[PDB]
Amino acid sequence: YQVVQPINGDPFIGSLETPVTSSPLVAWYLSNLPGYRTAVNPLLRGIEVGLAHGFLLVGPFVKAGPLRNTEIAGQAGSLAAGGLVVILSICLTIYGISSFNEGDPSTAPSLTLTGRKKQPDQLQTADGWAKFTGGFFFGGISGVIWAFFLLYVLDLP
Amino acid sequence: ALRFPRFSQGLAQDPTTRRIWFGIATAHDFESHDDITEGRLYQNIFASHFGQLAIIFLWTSGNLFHVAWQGNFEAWVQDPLHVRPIAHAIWDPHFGQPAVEAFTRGGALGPVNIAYSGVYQWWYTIGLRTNEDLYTGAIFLLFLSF
Amino acid sequence: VYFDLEDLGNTTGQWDLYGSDAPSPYNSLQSKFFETFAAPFTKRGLLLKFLILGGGSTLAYFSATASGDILPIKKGPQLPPQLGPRLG
């Protein structure tokens, strides 16, 4: 009995299967993250990603920033997280513009791990990527706003 | 050609990051570009010479403008041996208050750099006296660059 | 079989390992909400322009209207100017 096996049975594809890679807990969790919802409209997945990340970025900017100890503007240091959402959204946009042309099909895999034919994720299309970028921007600005809306009754404001 | 660098098909067909790097480092070696001729060589060099001259004029024009607009020139002419000349002003949002204080010198309203190029002594020696003269110079040089 | 000249995606491991392929867990009305509101940002070129000009003018705004209580560089020096080694 051995825990490590080749990836999907093929020992000459360069990888391995471990509790870290192929595990029911891990496979379910990764499968239930927005990026891995291949049939969903990329705009909604971008909404979720942007909401989570934009919400996250507020913390370090406010607590570690230069105005951190001037509580009058230190709280308002969330503008910086907003600006980073802007810059990241630029990076996404030029990534898609550079990566996908107008009429090209998805570059995502069209097979499953078990060999059956799959429909490829539209995220890897020019239109799908543009939708994911718009969703990440909207959700990101929105998540920053939501985090900034809560200044109260938290052990680390 | 088909992509950057357009002057080298062997570099554009490189799938590695090298293609970018060598596109930059070979941009001026005209003799090694695709389909180069002697005529194209000389003409590209000639135009590049005009471009260099324009850069030089624009640069000196900038120095003139900054001495006139942020510098000590008029005050420096009256006391050459006790006025530190001013290159230009410092607007850096990373400064703490101590930097704003310590770099504010030469008899100026904010932080400045002291010039060590010696353009004050030169322009003073050749007859320039007012910031107005310096502005006329700077606009003349911007014109020459154009 | 792990080698098939007919299907190389399987032969070369071109799979979606963690792709769910399940239907949307996002309920509608939420979906239509974000689909109608994030729609103007789904044109990538237009979004690029809106981000560069919007963020650029935003930056210009907070830079032009900054207060000395925030930036020492606008506050300017508040001390009497010192004296140089030999000069002013």
């Binding site: 810059i87 030029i94 550079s98 | 002003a89 607007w91 | 650029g56 930056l59 210009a60 830079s63």
Partner: peptide, 30 residues
Amino acid sequence: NLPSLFVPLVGLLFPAVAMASLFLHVEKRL
């Protein structure tokens, strides 16, 4: 006042635009 406009203009906006644009030109395929 003017440095508060042009320092972020050429130190933030101009490098972002130039880097993005050059990125696009450099990644283009004809």
